[PDB]
């Protein structure tokens, strides 16, 4: 009951698992059963990250890298110093993200809201699971996963991308990039329009939604509306995440080779060649 | 995770595949 209106909303119920067992708050944070699971998994994952780092060549936070086992090890559980730490941290991260989704669902139920936020975050959880669980399983080795390091997973991204020639020629990658760019443009437009509506110039009063409609019809000839903009932004962000997961999952499992050669299909269409 | 050990997988890749 910190916020001036918070107290009346802090009621029992809305939990999926646990009921009244963990139905309480700790400061601003609601816990629930999935909050307990999130706390355990996330704290264990962080502690194991730092335990594996202490066994590594450096404690520099830039250069800390918890690496997966070698490809020759296949899909077996490796020794902790030889990639097992990475596997345990991956399991902890999966559990933590799933528990975060379920805690968001419980909090949505407590406030009389639908499950839009848990589903939206579950899209990103699916992207991560595709990156570090599904793709290594399909490829046959845990060594295909990206390392747990701030700058070494960028090295993983670079090397995996260049293993296919130029990763820019992946068409699902093109679609995901288009969704990302359109999302950022849409977010700029939506934030700017709302702020300009509530922060007028020239000493005028706060505007109505008719003013936003008029502004975007004078600008580009069309206005999507107040509900439509949030629908479109959610669609764009979720599509960006989902198509990122799809684009990475098919490279190395379904498509092997240079993505540049794929576009030789276009030149062979009998309509123009 | 599979039912094998990492050492067994590495030995199989080296000897049974990369050595013969």
């Amino acid at each position: 009951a910190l916020l001036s209106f918070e107290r009346k909303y802090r009621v029992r119920g809305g939990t999926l698992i646990g009921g009244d067992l963990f139905d309480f708050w700790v400061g601003p944070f609601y816990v629930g059963f999935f909050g307990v699971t999130t706390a355990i998994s996330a704290l264990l994952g962080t502690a194991l990250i730092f335990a594996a780092a202490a066994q590594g060549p450096t404690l520099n936070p830039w250069l800390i890298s918890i690496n997966p086992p070698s490809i020759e090890a296949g899909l077996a559980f490796a020794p902790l110093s030889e990639g097992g730490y990475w596997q345990v941290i991956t399991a902890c991260a999966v559990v933590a993200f799933s528990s975060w989704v379920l805690r968001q669902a419980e909090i949505s139920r407590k406030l009389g809201m639908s499950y839009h936020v848990p589903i939206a975050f579950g899209v990103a959880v699916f992207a991560y699971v595709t990156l570090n669980v599904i793709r290594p399983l399909w490829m046959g080795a845990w060594g295909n996963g990206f390392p747990y390091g701030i700058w070494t997973h960028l090295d993983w991204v670079s090397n995996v991308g260049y293993a296919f020639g130029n990763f820019h020629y992946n068409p699902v990658h093109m679609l995901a990039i288009t969704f990302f760019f359109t999302n950022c443009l849409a977010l700029a437009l939506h934030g700017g329009l709302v702020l300009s509506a509530v922060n007028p110039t020239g000493g005028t009063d706060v505007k109505t939604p008719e003013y936003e409609d008029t502004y975007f019809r004078d600008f580009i000839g069309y206005s999507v509306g107040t509900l439509g903009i949030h629908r479109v932004g959610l669609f764009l962000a979720l599509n960006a995440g989902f198509w990122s997961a799809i684009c990475i999952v098919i490279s190395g499992t379904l498509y092997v080779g240079s993505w540049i050669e794929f576009w030789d299909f276009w030149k062979k269409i009998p309509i123009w060649s | 995770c599979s039912g094998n050990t990492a050492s067994g997988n590495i030995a199989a890749e080296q000897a049974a595949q990369e050595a013969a």
Binding site: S4, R7, K8, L16, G19, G112, V198, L227 | -
Partner: protein, 265 residues
Amino acid sequence: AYIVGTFDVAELAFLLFFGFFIALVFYLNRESRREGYPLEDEQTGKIHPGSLFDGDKKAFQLPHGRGTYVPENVARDDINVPGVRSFRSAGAPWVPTGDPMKDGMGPAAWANRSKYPDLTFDGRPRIVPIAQSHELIIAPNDPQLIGWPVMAADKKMVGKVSDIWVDQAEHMIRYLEVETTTGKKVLAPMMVASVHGNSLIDALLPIVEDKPKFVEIDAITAAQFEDVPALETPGIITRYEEDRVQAYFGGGYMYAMPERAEPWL
């Protein structure tokens, strides 16, 4: 490329942006503190002092001659809520003493909104029955919805649809008027109403189907429809009344039946 020693232009730009971003985060927190602050104690309700980095209060120049808003001056909620803590701790939930839907607790809670209706840019009431709108009609290929049966959360037929309320600014249906068995007319949010018999896939499907065309409201039961908050003036709904109706229907997803508040197990 070095400015002095190992300092270079790129490093200087990065450090400048890092400082700017810290300042921007502080500014964004200041902006986020404008509603609901200062904080208060969970039990005693004692108000916390206030941030050292806060500035001046924000004043909104309202249209239609409604004055200034000043969100920092919004009256704090009453400390005495119609509930009792499940256990005596700062983090325990409140169990409502009576009817949460009537008293406004948890998902059924409402805010003290303005007691006058929202207006269009020219001063007309924004949310009005579709007859009072300015030549606004339902899409001819869309469901008419007038006279359709209404299903409640307990699968009972509470009544029928007698009127449609539309937003004159956004050109959207906001409320459906439902006449119940007892004859009382109540407003139900369109966002809690599922329209059946108008599926896009079913239209695409090459079938001849006599699906029942009705409106389902699974938020509240048929009896609860008799306790929907009423309007002070016909044909007009205020912001406070809108909040009342929306809170009453939204709280039903937890409070319509006891099982809705229980874990799956």
